[PDB]
Structure formats: C-alpha cells, structure tokens
Design a protein around this nucleic acid. Sequence first.
DNA 1: TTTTTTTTTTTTTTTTTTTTTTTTTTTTTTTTTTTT
Length: 137
Amino acid sequence: NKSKAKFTSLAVRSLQDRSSLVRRNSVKLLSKLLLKHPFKAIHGSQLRLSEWEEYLKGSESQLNSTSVLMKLKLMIVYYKDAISFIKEIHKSIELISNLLFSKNRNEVLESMDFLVLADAFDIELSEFGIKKMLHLV
DNA sequence: TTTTTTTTTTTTTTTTTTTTTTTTTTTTTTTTTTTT
C-alpha cells in the first residue's frame, strides 16, 4: 500500500511527458489505481476532499481532547495519506482535463475513460472535467 | 471463449527530389577609324 502513493506521484509527473504513448499509459495506470484502492475499509468508494478534511479535523480534535494514543496516531496518518492521495488525483484530473485536446485519438479516449471513472466516485472537480469533455463535439 | 496471426496505424529518423538565386559565353547593332 505504501508504494501506491509513489506510483501515483510518478504517474502524475509522467502525465506531462512529451511522448503520447507514455501519457496514455500513465492515464491507464491512474485509472487502474483509482478503480481499486486500499482506501475502502471505511466510507469506501467515496473520495470527497471536504468530507475527508472534516473527518481529519474531527480526528485531530479527538486526539487533542493505552491503545488510544497509537490508535489515533494510525488513524491520523491514514487520513493524511488519504488526503494526499485525493490531492494527487485532483491534480491528475486537472492535468488530464487540460490534456483532453490531443492529436492522437487513443489518448483522448483514455482521458475520457479516466474522467468518467473519476466522475463515478463523487469528486468536486469531476464536474469541471465533464464540462471540458462536453466541448469534444 | 481464448490465443495467435495479419495488417494497419503511429511515431522518429533518414533520405530524395525540387529549385531558387549565382555566374558565364556568344552574337548583334552602333559608332569611330582608315582606305581608297
């Protein structure tokens, strides 16, 4: 699970690569990572930045107010990892939305598939991606 | 249904044809000169 964040960061960085095939494969990797993630034990299949931030704030308040110490520590580090992953996915979504207008059709199709998958899970910036996709006519 | 083969397309890299400017040789007509 730890290497998942590294793979996501490398894929987001490679999204800006000059080669088109590399970009399509990075989009595929991000789609595969978003389709199944370890972040499903609690409130699975729902990636909302506001809700996760509120949950993290609640956990921080609970810790501020024997097993309790490290249990809250693990919960907080898990929530921080979730927030970082959500931010990375949001940045990747923005990059792919900017990347929608490409000469190669396979890249466009994979970008549309990734945006649809990201829209399937409730995402605040998914509507922007759908709006950008609407101009593909 | 699953796997293999074909063929088709997508690049990057190299190769091929086209041609725009860069110089040259020969002839022509006019003007001036010399000679009956």
